[PDB]
A paper describes a structure:
Human [name] (huUHRF1; ubiquitin-like containing [name] and RING finger domains 1), also called ICBP90, is a multi-domain nuclear protein associated with cellular proliferation and epigenetic regulation. huUHRF1 contains a plant homeodomain or [name] finger (huUHRF1-[name]) that was shown to be necessary in the opening of dense chromocenter structures, possibly through its chromatin-binding ability. We proved that huUHRF1-[name] is a histone H3 reader that shows preference for unmethylated versus trimethylated H3K4. In this work we show that the [name] finger of human [name] represents a new mode of histone H3 recognition that requires the appendage of an additional zinc finger, relies mainly on the recognition of H3R2, and shows preference for unmethylated H3K4, although it can accommodate H3K4me3 without compromising the complex formation.
Two forms of the protein were produced, huUHRF1-PHD314–367, which contains the canonical [name] finger sequence, and huUHRF1-PHD296–367, a larger version that includes the additional putative zinc finger. Indeed, we were unable to determine the structure of the complex between H3 peptide and huUHRF1-PHD314–367, the shorter form of the protein that lacks the additional zinc finger. Crystals of huUHRF1-PHD314–367 obtained in different crystallization conditions and grown in the presence of a large molar excess of H3 peptides belong to space group P6522 and diffracted X-rays up to 1.43 Å resolution. However, the crystal structures invariably showed one protein molecule in the asymmetric unit with no peptide bound. The structure of huUHRF1-PHD314–367 in the free state is very similar to the structure of huUHRF1-PHD296–367 in complex with the histone H3 peptide except for a significant shift of residues 353–358 in loop L2, which anchor the N-terminal amino group of H3A1 in the huUHRF1-PHD296–367 -H3 structure, and a major conformational change of the N-terminal region (residues 314–316). In the absence of the additional zinc finger, the N-terminal tail (residues 311–316) of huUHRF1-PHD314–367 blocks the binding of the histone peptide in two different ways. First, the Cα of C316 is displaced by 3.3 Å towards the histone H3 binding site and its side chain is flipped towards the position of the H3K4 side chain in the huUHRF1-PHD296–367-H3 structure. This conformation of C316 suggests that when this residue is not engaged in the additional zinc finger, it could interfere with histone binding. Second, due to crystal packing, the N-terminus of a symmetrically related molecule occupies the histone binding site. All together, the flexibility of the C316 residue and the crystal packing artifact could explain the difficulty to obtain crystals of huUHRF1-PHD314–367 with the histone H3 peptide bound.
Author numbering: 311 to 365
């Protein structure tokens, strides 16, 4: 298989993969700290929808 780049949609960085969430609709990655407002911790739950897709 191939590796996806998964850069943060907001900042363009790949740092702190442990602090990134992937949107289960649009498949884009986000740092929790790049969201406006930021999420404080990576939720233990494996489902997540970005601000665009949740609405
Ligand atoms: Zn970011
Ligand atoms: Zn999304």
């Amino acid at each position: 298989g191939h590796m996806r780049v998964c850069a943060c949609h907001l900042c363009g960085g790949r740092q702190d993969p442990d602090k990134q969430l992937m949107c289960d609709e649009c498949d884009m990655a986000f740092h929790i700290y790049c969201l406006d407002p930021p999420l404080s911790s990576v939720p233990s739950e494996d489902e997540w929808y970005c601000p665009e897709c949740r609405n």
